[PDB]
Paper text:
WT β2m is a well folded 99-residue protein, adopting a β-sandwich immunoglobulin fold, which is very stable under physiological conditions. β2m is the light chain of the class I major histocompatibility complex, a stable ternary complex that also comprises the heavy chain and an 8–11-residue peptide bound by the heavy chain. The MHCI is assembled in the endoplasmic reticulum and thereafter transported to the extracellular side of the cell membrane, to which MHCI is anchored by a short transmembrane domain. Human D76N β2-microglobulin (β2m) variant is the prototype of unstable and amyloidogenic protein that forms abundant extracellular fibrillar deposits. Here we focus on the role of the class I major histocompatibility complex (MHCI) in the intracellular stabilization of D76N β2m.
To explore potential effects on MHCI stability by D76N variant β2m, as compared with the WT species, the prototypic heavy chain of MHCI, HLA-A0201 (HLA-A2), was refolded in the presence of each of the two β2m variants and of two different peptides. The selected epitopes NY-ESO-1(Y1V9) and FR-20(Y3) are modified peptide ligand variants from the melanoma-associated antigen NY-ESO-1 (23) and multiple myeloma-associated antigen FR-20 (24), respectively. Crystal structures of MHCI76 pI and of WT MHCI pI were determined at 2.65 and 3.1 Å resolution, respectively. MHCI76 pI and WT MHCI pI produced isomorphous crystals belonging to the orthorhombic space group P212121. The asymmetric unit contains 14 MHCI moieties, arranged in two juxtaposed heptameric rings, a previously unreported packing for MHCI crystal structures, containing 69% solvent content. In both crystal structures, the electron density is of excellent quality for all the 14 MHCI units, except for the 87–91-residue stretch in all 14 HLA-A2 molecules. WT MHCI pI and the MHCI76 pI complexes are also well superposable, displaying a root mean square deviation value of about 0.5 Å over the all Cα chains in the asymmetric unit. The thermal unfolding curves for WT MHCI and MHCI76, presenting the same peptide, are almost perfectly superimposable; conversely, both WT MHCI and MHCI76 sigmoid curves are markedly shifted according to the nature of the peptide bound to the heavy chain. When the same experiment was carried out on the two β2m species associated in their MHCI assembly, at a trypsin/MHCI ratio of 1/200, both β2m species turned out to be fully protected from proteolytic digestion.
Numbering used by the authors:
A (entry chain m): 1 to 9
B (entry chain B): 0 to 99
C (entry chain A): 1 to 276
Amino acid sequence: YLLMWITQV
Amino acid sequence: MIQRTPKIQVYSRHPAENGKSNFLNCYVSGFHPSDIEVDLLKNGERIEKVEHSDLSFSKDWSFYLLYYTEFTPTEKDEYACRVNHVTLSQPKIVKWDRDM
Amino acid sequence: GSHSMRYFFTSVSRPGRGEPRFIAVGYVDDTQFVRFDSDAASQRMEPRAPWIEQEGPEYWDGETRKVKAHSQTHRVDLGTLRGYYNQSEAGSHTVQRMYGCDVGSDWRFLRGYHQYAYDGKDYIALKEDLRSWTAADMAAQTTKHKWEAAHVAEQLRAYLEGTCVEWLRRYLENGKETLQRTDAPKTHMTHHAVSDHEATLRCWALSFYPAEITLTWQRDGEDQTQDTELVETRPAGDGTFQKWAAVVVPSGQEQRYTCHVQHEGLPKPLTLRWEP
Ligand SMILES: [Cl-]
Ligand SMILES: [Cl-]
């Protein structure tokens, strides 16, 4: 179940 | 930009038996970058409808892929795996050894 | 045993060729269960394990959207990373990312991780405590400082302890038939005369799951990791794994050597002796 989001590097 | 040369193992899914349907495997691993040409050869000729795994990597970030095709080994047909990669000066050809 | 869930992400920039290549693969233990490839035609997260096909439309729409937000962030990062390192905006680069959770025998959160690499080298990684980061260089530090200010590890930690662990367990119950199985290795040995004074013994392990296995050789009962050849464990392609260990021996001493197979699916370690 993926992350609802990932924060840009 | 690390660059790792791909290891290559060529094998069948099940133990080889002549005239029984099986799957030919090329397993290329330990490489980087991910761009890599892999063809399975029957008597030198590229097999056309060859499927392969999704790209994935290991603890050290190096890439791996499983190429595979359905096939019937007979005692006359010689099979091999041809890999080309930016680390390789020239295509590497690994022959299939069944009865190892 | 303890179980794990893991997602792998690779995005490769392709200047001149077109928009970056994005690939995602989802694992529970050693079984793949989903995937997404930007170059594929579905544009969906796709099931690659029977047990995940159970899941309803609410699920696939959810996963599909999230993997695309994942892809889009990487679209941006390729740009930002290139900028950080002042790199000729014309060259193919690679970002890889892997994250996930482990649980114990009790199926309770055990471990959490999140790892990020740029061009094959470590970039940034959540540390074992799930509160702070290890940054590999000055670029990574910039990301660290940014991520620290905005309390990112906190959000991640929430997920790795919570959702990750909860859905892992969901996948294990639902996929109980297969994920929780062990396929004991099918073993046999082969003999190969190489000279008049030298023969190659090979120990074979096929059809076993999970990939974790140990094959070692022993002369008269004493280990010989010094003189053998292990091959990297490899996929059969049908969900199972294979491996062989080889040792070259003097003619007439084959009976002294034994292969010792150890695998979660076996009751007690297998000894295979050269009994005539
Ligand atoms: Cl054929
Ligand atoms: Cl491709």
